[PDB]
Design a protein around this ligand. Structure first.
Ligand SMILES: O=C(CS)Nc1ccc2ccccc2c1
Ligand SMILES: O=C(CS)Nc1ccc2ccccc2c1
Ligand SMILES: [Zn+2]
Ligand SMILES: [Zn+2]
Ligand SMILES: [Zn+2]
Ligand SMILES: [Zn+2]
Lengths: 228, 231
């Protein structure tokens, strides 16, 4: 764990790091959110902002210091503040941003800045390549509604890593923290679909837990089974 | 009502010179017959369908009524989410040679829901309007994804050249007491999605919906106000 400003960075693989940012909430301090940073040849790719613009600027600052390669694009995994709260820092820096079309449609209602480009998905959940050109190792998959209607996931090609975002919680989790915008009928199938889409991922990275094994997927699905 | 026609178990009501509502019924134990409405649109030399009936056999009845009453080929159908009242009859559409379209997400959910997927997937811009390249030759059908509400995948359809907009199961009429939301509803965004449908078709004065007879725009307002209370 490397501290840099108020953020934490953890190398997960030779070309992959987890970024972690924290926000005090009423009655619960320092709520963590994780995203990813990926080195792809001569460029860097980001998955998710931090909670705030200032924190997301610090992600860019850490990249400059520790990797020193331009950030070519970012993908954000749904329209909540932990994932899209720092869009302005990316746009200020000229970084192209991508999100599920539905995330961009929800953004204004959620008080988020929309990404500059929209991803669309085939009926099997895989991103349409016309909408995700030149994504390098980021393999984007829409698993179905679960945590939200718009949640998307990202496999990191060539590594053991798949990012479930806020859809997956770790195997020690006690609840899904599902809310009005969760789809409790389909959550379990969407969680299993993420697992089936990245069948050889052995390190599951998540927004609100430290990385876990594939048991995080199964444990999350089994919790969701009870919500139907 | 005077003017409604019957073919088998189906009821048809003409709403405008080139638009009819189709109504089919499914018996639900303890409650009885539940109506579901869709649309039939005559577009020059062809017919376009919005939504199947609850079953394959009921959907075949729609197509046979079209042949008898309109006698133009059915070019395509749009279906408005992956529930049985809207997609229960996909096999019948396919057997009749009708090209079918649904939200990509509807096609992704269809297998989990016991439904057959449409042959083609519609995708949507960030402003909700369908991407034209996914909706070829749709004529007067203007397809709009208003956001999550009744389900994550619910879509809506305005009929150009008419005063009609179809809210499917997202919109209930101005006399409705509840929304009937289940685990797949998005109760946080439902209200804004209903209002977005109204804003997408701001001149429509006849609102058609799946589970109420046609209403004024009060159906949109009342639906959104009911949804406000679920947040
Ligand atoms: O995590 C997300 C988006 S997935 N949002 C929040 C919002 C408020 C919270 C309050 C206390 C603890 C965690 C919280 C997490
Ligand atoms: O099954 C669907 C799919 S949207 N819709 C309805 C609509 C109204 C109903 C009323 C009583 C019982 C079941 C009902 C089911
Ligand atoms: Zn979230
Ligand atoms: Zn989150
Ligand atoms: Zn429905
Ligand atoms: Zn319905």
């Amino acid at each position: 764990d490397q501290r840099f400003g108020d953020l934490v960075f953890r190398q997960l693989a030779p070309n992959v790091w987890q970024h972690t940012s924290y926000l005090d909430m009423p009655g619960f301090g320092a709520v963590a959110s994780n995203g990813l940073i990926v080195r792809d040849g001569g460029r860097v790719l980001v998955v998710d902002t931090a909670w705030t613009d200032d924190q997301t600027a610090q992600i860019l600052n850490w990249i400059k210091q520790e990797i020193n390669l331009p950030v070519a694009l970012a993908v954000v995994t749904h329209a909540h503040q932990d994932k899209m709260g720092g869009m302005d820092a990316l746009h200020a820096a000229g970084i192209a941003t991508y999100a599920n079309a539905l995330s961009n449609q929800l953004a204004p209602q959620e008080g988020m800045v929309a990404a500059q480009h929209s991803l669309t998905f085939a009926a099997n959940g895989w991103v349409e390549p016309a909408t995700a050109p030149n994504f390098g190792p980021l393999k984007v998959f829409y698993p179905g509604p679960g945590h939200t209607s718009d949640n998307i996931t990202v496999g990191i090609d060539g590594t053991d890593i798949a990012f479930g975002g806020c859809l997956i919680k770790d195997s020690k989790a006690k609840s899904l923290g599902n809310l009005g915008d969760a789809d409790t009928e389909h959550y379990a199938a969407s969680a299993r679909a993420f697992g089936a889409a990245f069948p050889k991922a052995s390190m599951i990275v998540m927004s609100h837990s430290a990385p876990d094994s594939r048991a995080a997927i199964t444990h999350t699905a089994r919790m969701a089974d009870k919500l139907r």
